Amino acid sequence: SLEARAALNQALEMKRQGKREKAQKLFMHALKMDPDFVDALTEFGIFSEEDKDIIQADYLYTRALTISPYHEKALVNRDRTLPLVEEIDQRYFSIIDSKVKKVMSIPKGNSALRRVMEETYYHHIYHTVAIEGNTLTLSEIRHILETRYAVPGKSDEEQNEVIGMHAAMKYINTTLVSRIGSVTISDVLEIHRRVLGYVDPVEAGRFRTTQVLVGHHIPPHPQDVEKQMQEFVQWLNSEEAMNLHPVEFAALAHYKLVYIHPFIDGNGRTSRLLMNLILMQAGYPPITIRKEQRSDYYHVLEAANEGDVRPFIRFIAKCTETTLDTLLFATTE
Numbered sequence: 001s002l003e004a005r006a007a008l009n010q011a012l013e014m015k016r017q018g019k020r021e022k023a024q025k026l027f028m029h030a031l032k033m034d035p036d037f038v039d040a041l042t043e044f045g046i047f048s049e050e051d052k053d054i055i056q057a058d059y060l061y062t063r064a065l066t067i068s069p070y071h072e073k074a075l076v077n078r079d080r081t082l083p084l085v086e087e088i089d090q091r092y093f094s095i096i097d098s099k100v101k102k103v104m105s106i107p108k109g110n111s112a113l114r115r116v117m118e119e120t121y122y123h124h125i126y127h128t129v130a131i132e133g134n135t136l137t138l139s140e141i142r143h144i145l146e147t148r149y150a151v152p153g154k155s156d157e158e159q160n161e162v163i164g165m166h167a168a169m170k171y172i173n174t175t176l177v178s179r180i181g182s183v184t185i186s187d188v189l190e191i192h193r194r195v196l197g198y199v200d201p202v203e204a205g206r207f208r209t210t211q212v213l214v215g216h217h218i219p220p221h222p223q224d225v226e227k228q229m230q231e232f233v234q235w236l237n238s239e240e241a242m243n244l245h246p247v248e249f250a251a252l253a254h255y256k257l258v259y260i261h262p263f264i265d266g267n268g269r270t271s272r273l274l275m276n277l278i279l280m281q282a283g284y285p286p287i288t289i290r291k292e293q294r295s296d297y298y299h300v301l302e303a304a305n306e307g308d309v310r311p312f313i314r315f316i317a318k319c320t321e322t323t324l325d326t327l328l329f330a331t332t333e
């Protein structure tokens, strides 16, 4: 309905100007012209909740969610499944928590743990670059970082991606992990400047100024990148984010940064480092997303884009358990 659309737009204009009596008449008129107008129902629900009429607000929200008979079935079924899913999810976080406490309890000065921590360091670097076509083997990566001699018959681009990761991981471990205070845009840029610096030092440490496309994702317009990065870091240091389970917080921080995708390149590597910083600050070890999990990683990211991030959190939770099981397995004494 063209009149329903018009009635809602004026209803919202009257709401901003503080004419609530006129806004209500127009909300009612929008629903008279189109009873199944989702926008007007949801928006009139928000208006009703502001006036502290909870029953009416709930009626309008529920009406908007259940237009057709198949929506009604979806709601009654979802209301049944949600509690069971909440239980399954909560269980999996408590299972991770127990394994974290077992890893943390082990003395920092342990012969076994030190070897594992040293070996898994190169595993993360390997998987973080190999997941997007870096053909360097694990022994080659160690050679590059331990000796600082280049390997033969492998591109300087591939090897400078490894050097950049090592530089970024050192910076975090020494400077940021134990640093008490808020994480700022500058800190993210400092990580990115090291991650991409050795490959593209021109673009390393500054936002993109062009439109791009990441897989099946449409990231923000370059002119809106900076505002969304300000809103992002505001959330990072919010009380809401502090309450979240570290794995949930680390997963959300990861997804939000690759959604904004504020750099021309190195967005994945940067967002995975920020994920591990948050976990390390919370007392968890650094986790790895293996190159074998690329399709799963992309699938849960595409699901997150279309408005369900829970699969991505669950995916990061799986990657966390796998990392902990690897540390706990090395009790070979």
Ligand SMILES: Nc1ncnc2c1ncn2[C@@H]1O[C@H](COP(=O)(O)OP(=O)(O)OP(=O)(O)O)[C@@H](O)[C@H]1O
Pocket: 128, 129, 130, 131, 132, 214, 215, 216, 217, 258, 259, 263, 264, 265, 266, 267, 268, 269, 270, 298, 301, 302, 305
């Ligand atoms: N649908 C999606 N929505 C959001 N982010 C996505 C999506 N698909 C992929 N990504 C992320 O974007 C990354 C690719 O962007 P970019 O090339 O800037 O990262 P990179 O650091 O060069 O790659 P990588 O770290 O994976 O080796 C992927 O690795 C992934 O983390």
Ligand SMILES: [Mg+2]
Pocket: 132, 265, 266, 267
């Ligand atoms: Mg890339």
